[PDB]
Amino acid sequence: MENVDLVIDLQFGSTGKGLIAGYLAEKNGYDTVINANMPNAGHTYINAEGRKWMHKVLPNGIVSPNLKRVMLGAGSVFSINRLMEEIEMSKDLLHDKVAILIHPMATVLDEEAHKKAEVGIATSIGSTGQGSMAAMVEKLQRDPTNNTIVARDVAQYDGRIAQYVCTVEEWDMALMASERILAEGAQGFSLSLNQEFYPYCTSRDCTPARFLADMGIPLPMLNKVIGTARCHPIRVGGTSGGHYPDQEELTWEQLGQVPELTTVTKKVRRVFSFSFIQMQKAMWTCQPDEVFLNFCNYLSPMGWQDIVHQIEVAAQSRYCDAEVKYLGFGPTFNDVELREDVM
Amino acid sequence: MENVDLVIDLQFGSTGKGLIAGYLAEKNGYDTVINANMPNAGHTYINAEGRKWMHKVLPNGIVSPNLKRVMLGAGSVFSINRLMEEIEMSKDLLHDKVAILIHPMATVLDEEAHKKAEVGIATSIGSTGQGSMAAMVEKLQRDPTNNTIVARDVAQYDGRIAQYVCTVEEWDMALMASERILAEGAQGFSLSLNQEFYPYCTSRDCTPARFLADMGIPLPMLNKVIGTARCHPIRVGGTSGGHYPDQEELTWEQLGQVPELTTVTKKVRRVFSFSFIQMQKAMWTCQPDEVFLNFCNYLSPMGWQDIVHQIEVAAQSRYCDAEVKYLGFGPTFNDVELREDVM
């Protein structure tokens, strides 16, 4: 039954999960791609030809040459307008023989109401203010008169998603019928609701157990976990929370790099030195089998080789057999290197 | 690393998870007992001597002869008054050499405000109205001025829990230092937020993936899953939701048994015939290794033997190796029989 490869972030997010998901989809040729994204932030993949996908709804794995199923988990929070645009942009990949399945209990974002509710926390905790938690709360209220929050009910008056919304039985059968599955996790380990930075965190745990639960994947289906990390972990701009005791906040000037910003709000990302403590904590809970170490282009060979080294000993210390298999030197498929080939 | 035994419910709850947890604790002698309960759930264990434990906070596994650690997960929602009463009632078991650990992000119930917020759903969906979701929502709001919702902040002004509230580091170390762990799940598979009965469901998924996430247990620690079921599945009284297509609602008079009353409330439980569809769905997602079939005292030998049989074929059909190892014939330790000894 072990046929699921799960992509997980080991730090505070924006490690390049979109790039490794697209790289693994092209290399391994999964028939099923699945996720449980909320509108907090996007995922970027750029192939060998320079074609770019920037997704908030659809998995980046839709680039798989053997694609048959695209699955949006029960933990999903999505804009219907955005989903329509993403499907349209990749119409060539999402042909007649590709089934798009939206879990009946996936949450429909009310762009006006859900973002207006998060205006306060967007400043107080540096929240993305995308309406993720406000939409989640509305679903949790379980009011039988509210037919405007879950995909199953919304589809009865908004026909744009009616062809995609499946039953719970169809969801379990789609997973059962799958040969090889790529499960795409979002956000970051240290952003977990139940990690130590509360309330400077997201609205859920960002762990393999929580991502498998949000996608309705039974635990025996898990084949391997692919953990992602940066040489210099980031946080979003503003009063976005603390860091670990073994790390320090840096400036983009100190790195000799162009300041990283969010795509839409243009908020300058906060940047930190590598944390071994964060790595031990992420290793203990996430237990990855393989690691992707990205943004190696920000350091000299001695620098990123030392971090590869720190990661593997941090894994061993927390009973984890994780091996750094991939190294990122840029944002495209061409910038992903095999560790064995460069060190 | 495989040292966690997880107790989960395969139906709509009240299958007797409290009884099997207490039975397994006395037989296997776990040093660590862990859960992530909410005030909607009551759990009962009665030992061989007649001593009764009715818990809403503490795991029932505290009856273990080798008890060293009692752990209340980050997913916990608890009344401090109730926790105080449960600790006092089991003072003999919770001696100086037993460490009680409350996750820093476990939620403190505000009995007035959280229960008042759930008055509506207590009738509309037959919710227990115990304040579980209202407390969960307050934590999700992540307001930095609110120091009254998570255990970590509450421990700074309410000294009743200050000795028990640990750090996230202490939590991971407690799990790492443990020899054998009993993880106690609550509610039921079919009550899951993302099963087909929405909005007639609870405020989370009741699956092994969600319960391991709510207790902060890494996936490689899972040794085995013990699924629980009744011969006649139940629901709470009122407009509490639908049933599966292969089952029918019965009466307590039709069964010739005394009407069961809900633990948190006082309402008469709704009772149904066994559902094979429910069992296949629960088997597919929960994937138990062992099964406890309880309330066999409500049927004749031919009747419960047929149900044991249906369960095992439902498991096989969903690629699950589950074996019915235990049979319940009453509410005490003495009423738990090994299947091999009676059929």
Ligand SMILES: Nc1ncnc2c1ncn2[C@@H]1O[C@H](COP(=O)(O)OP(=O)(O)OP(=O)(O)O)[C@@H](O)[C@H]1O
């Ligand atoms: N090594 C690299 N060098 C430079 N830019 C890169 C590199 N790898 C990825 N990027 C860019 O970094 C940005 C953040 O990455 P991306 O959105 O894919 O991350 P993510 O891990 O999926 O984020 P999150 O889950 O937090 O939304 C993107 O604009 C991406 O193209």
Ligand SMILES: Nc1ncnc2c1ncn2[C@@H]1O[C@H](COP(=O)(O)OP(=O)(O)OP(=O)(O)O)[C@@H](O)[C@H]1O
């Ligand atoms: N075989 C049995 N026959 C009769 N009564 C029983 C039997 N087993 C347990 N009981 C009683 O029936 C009730 C079952 O609820 P209990 O708290 O034990 O279950 P639970 O599975 O832990 O509940 P929850 O849904 O809240 O997680 C209790 O009052 C218990 O003492």
Ligand SMILES: Nc1nc2c(ncn2[C@H]2C[C@H](O)[C@@H](COP(=O)(O)O)O2)c(=O)[nH]1
């Ligand atoms: N990089 C990144 N940060 C996120 C994401 N989701 C949440 N966060 C961070 C931003 C804030 O510091 C904090 C709270 O934001 P939010 O969950 O949107 O309310 O979590 C994500 O997908 N990526």
Ligand SMILES: Nc1nc2c(ncn2[C@H]2C[C@H](O)[C@@H](COP(=O)(O)O)O2)c(=O)[nH]1
């Ligand atoms: N039997 C049982 N029902 C529960 C439990 N927790 C919740 N429920 C049911 C009662 C309602 O039908 C539904 C909504 O309840 P609540 O989670 O209290 O809002 O879930 C539990 O532990 N046992």
Ligand SMILES: O=CN(O)CC(=O)O
């Ligand atoms: O870089 C991506 N952002 O975090 C999301 C957006 O603002 O669009």
